[PDB]
């Protein structure tokens, strides 16, 4: 909406107010939209035990496709956007401008895979707030969508060749960042809550949990046609917003379908000492801010 010239602007996607803001808005919208029949939230220290707080409420079944959330500048501030096609969210940017609001953004809730998001405009791009740190999420973003179709009957389908081919594009970009002599391996999640261990997403108002092992089992730079993932709806969630357990009602539809486009991934690097030359990667996520970051990286907000 205005292309500032002779202007150089530091960005640091890793310290962006917008991310936190979006996150509070999203969380807030789900709470309002999708209410559980029982919500267990523990409160601590005080006394000795940890007095767990319980909220029981009517839990109307509600499923509908989340509409895109545009995010805008609050009274007093301004939104700068970087116009580079490729962009690592850090340092100076010169092709930049001010804008009313950000683009529409699907407030999709999920782990491992980023569904229905923006594709990279050139090549596959990988992001971290510290690649050296084997504890920080690696955000992948694709230039090509990969369909993934899921059903309440308990599975997700994916074209093996498309995926197989997506993995090539990444392992490639990975050994570009960790040495070109390095072997890229993909393995299943290494443990933790089901929501982190499986590719967990919402759909029809129901929470899916899909065994993604089949997607992360290969070795690069060292069959069957359509990958079918076993899944499961659960009524007992670990919440993503705050640390709570929540029980929802069983489903009331026999036709719960979900055709989404994988547009990015949340990986995690094993790392660790081992003069051995190869890098292990596993499907990560769980921290929805990573998800908002995958979309808001090209943005910053500044005192007018």
């Amino acid at each position, epitope marked *: 909406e205005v292309v500032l010239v002779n202007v150089t602007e530091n960005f640091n996607w890793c310290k962006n107010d917008m991310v936190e803001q979006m996150h509070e808005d999203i969380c807030s919208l789900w709470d309002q939209s999708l209410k559980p029949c*029982v919500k267990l939230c523990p409160l601590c220290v005080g006394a000795g035990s940890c007095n767990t707080s319980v909220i029981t409420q009517a839990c109307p079944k509600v499923s509908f496709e989340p509409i895109p959330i545009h995010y805008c500048a609050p009274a007093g501030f301004a939104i700068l956007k970087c116009n580079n096609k490729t962009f690592n969210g850090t340092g100076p940017c010169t092709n930049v401008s001010t804008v009313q609001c950000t683009h529409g953004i699907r407030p999709v809730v999920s782990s491992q895979l980023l569904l229905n998001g923006s594709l990279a405009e050139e090549e596959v791009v990988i992001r971290s707030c510290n690649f050296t740190d084997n504890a920080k999420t690696i955000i992948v973003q694709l230039n090509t969508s990969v369909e993934i179709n899921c059903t309440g009957a308990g599975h997700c389908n994916i074209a093996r060749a498309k995926w197989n081919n997506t993995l090539k594009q990444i392992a490639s970009k990975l050994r570009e960042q960790f040495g070109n002599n390095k072997t890229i391996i993909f393995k299943q999640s290494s443990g933790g809550d089901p929501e982190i261990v499986t590719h967990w997403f919402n759909c029809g108002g129901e929470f899916f*949990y899909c065994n993604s092992t089949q997607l992360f089992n290969s070795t690069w730079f060292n069959g069957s046609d359509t990958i079918t993932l076993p899944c499961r709806i*659960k*009524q007992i*969630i670990n919440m993503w917003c705050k640390v709570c357990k929540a029980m929802y009602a069983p489903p009331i539809s026999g036709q719960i379908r979900c055709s989404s486009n994988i547009t990015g991934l949340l990986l995690t690097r094993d790392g660790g000492n081992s003069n051995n030359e190869s890098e292990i990667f596993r499907p990560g996520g769980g921290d929805m801010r990573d998800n908002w970051r995958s979309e808001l990286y090209k943005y910053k907000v500044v005192k007018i």
Partner: antibody
Amino acid sequence: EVQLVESGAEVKKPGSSVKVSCKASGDTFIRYSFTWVRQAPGQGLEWMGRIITILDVAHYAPHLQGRVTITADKSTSTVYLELRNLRSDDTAVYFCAGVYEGEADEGEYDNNGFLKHWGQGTLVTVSS
Amino acid sequence: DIVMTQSPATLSVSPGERATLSCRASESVSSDLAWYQQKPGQAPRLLIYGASTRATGVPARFSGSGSGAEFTLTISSLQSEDFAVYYCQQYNNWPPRYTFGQGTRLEIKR
């Protein structure tokens, strides 16, 4: 196919409180929910409350609220009913009942409100 | 709350004949309806749930139907051990405040 075995009869003076138990055998405790139901002589059945064993969250009839507590010790598969400030009209047989609710430990929970399994009943008599 | 009225209070059926028990709510409860059976001195026995599902162990001459607020139980042919008291329970609302009927007493007619 769980077996529910309750505790012996209780004799209480009005104002006393009572705690009846219910040992649950042969299956997976945390996969069941337990509901206490009672019946005055010559009278019908009355839902008292219900515990979601795996969450330790119990819900109660609005007309007992405050003076009834239901609990469950997962480490011995036993369930408990506590009636406080007893009245003569609290004299009844208190039953212990439960239905299977799904692979709970794995997120699955029907939240069934029927009652397939019962105990033999416990007579609680409240009187001067 | 949801009041559950059963009729009639007493059913005098002749052995081997047809019994039909009516259970009526004071508002819709979809299919969250169950029928129990009680014999003097013992715990009840779940018969039907979901308005029309026979519990494991229940014979076929037992069958329940209806939904919303209009429910009914049928015993196609009466064995001697079928004469008892029958209760209907609703378990629809949330938070959960489930309610029973006052029962129908089914007795041998002679």
